[PDB]
């Protein structure tokens, strides 16, 4: 996917539209990603499980990768990504500024 | 153990390594049966090591012909 673990992304669709956060996990086979503070779910945790304490646990749920957009390193605006070849190595380029993302 | 190390080993060393790996795998299987093996991935590791050793031995005895 064009989004990668550790990237800083902006949510462009969903309840969290407009939020920014770090990509902390990707699910390539589902085309989904997990972004900090985005798409919080409240799951019912039984205290009877291997974890003694239980209740309602709040954690991020995966979001579809097409709902997050990379932020341009220069302008900090959401941008699509192209690829250049520098000394035979692929480099992700922001299509707004033209700068290497990483 | 990987194919490069196996290809540095000599034929006699390949055979001895196969013997020792088989003995190791056998002890691992016995520990697993008796319930004393927590690190179960060693079994697969050793099985694939044996497979690689036999691959390389066969390659050598093929290129000889």
């Amino acid at each position: 996917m064009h989004i990668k673990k550790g990237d800083n992304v902006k949510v462009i669709a969903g309840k969290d539209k407009g939020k920014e956060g770090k990509v902390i996990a990707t699910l390539p086979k589902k085309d989904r990603v997990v972004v900090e503070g985005v798409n919080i779910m409240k799951k019912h945790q039984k205290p009877t499980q291997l974890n003694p304490e239980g209740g309602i646990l709040e954690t991020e749920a995966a979001i579809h990768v097409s709902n997050v957009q990379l932020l341009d390193p220069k302008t900090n605006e959401p941008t699509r990504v192209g690829y250049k070849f520098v000394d035979g190595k692929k480099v992700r380029i922001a299509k707004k500024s033209g700068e290497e993302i990483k | 153990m990987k194919a490069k190390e196996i290809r540095d080993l000599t034929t006699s060393e390949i055979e001895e390594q196969i013997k020792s790996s088989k003995e190791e795998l056998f002890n691992l299987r016995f520990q697993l049966a008796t319930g004393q093996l927590e690190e179960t991935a060693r079994i697969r590791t050793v099985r694939k090591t044996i497979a690689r050793l036999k691959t390389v031995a066969r390659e050598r005895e093929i290129e000889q012909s």
Binding site: - | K22, E23, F26, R29, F30, A33, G35
Partner: protein, 89 residues
């Protein structure tokens, strides 16, 4: 090939009583004979084998959900040692 003849030890109540009697129970390759079992045990555990009894166990029907099948057939040997001992643990 001895490590292939012997597959694993059998640990059950009857097998433990046998071990008290100096009889060790193993699952073995379904194709081998009593003599091969004896030689494999003697080579692996450096013991003297007094005798080997052997038996076959049919595949047993087993169910998991809506899927019907069978367990593997088994060949079980009981090796009575003449001299020495085997420590499985």
């Amino acid at each position: 090939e001895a490590r292939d003849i012997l597959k694993r030890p059998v640990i059950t109540e009857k097998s433990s009583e046998a071990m008290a009697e100096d009889k060790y129970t193993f699952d073995v390759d379904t194709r081998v004979n009593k003599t091969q079992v004896k030689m494999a045990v003697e080579e692996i555990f450096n013991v003297k084998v007094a005798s080997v009894n052997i038996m076959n166990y049919k595949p047993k029907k087993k169910r998991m959900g809506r899927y019907q099948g069978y367990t593997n057939k088994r060949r079980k040997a009981i090796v009575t040692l003449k001299e020495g001992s085997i420590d499985l643990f």
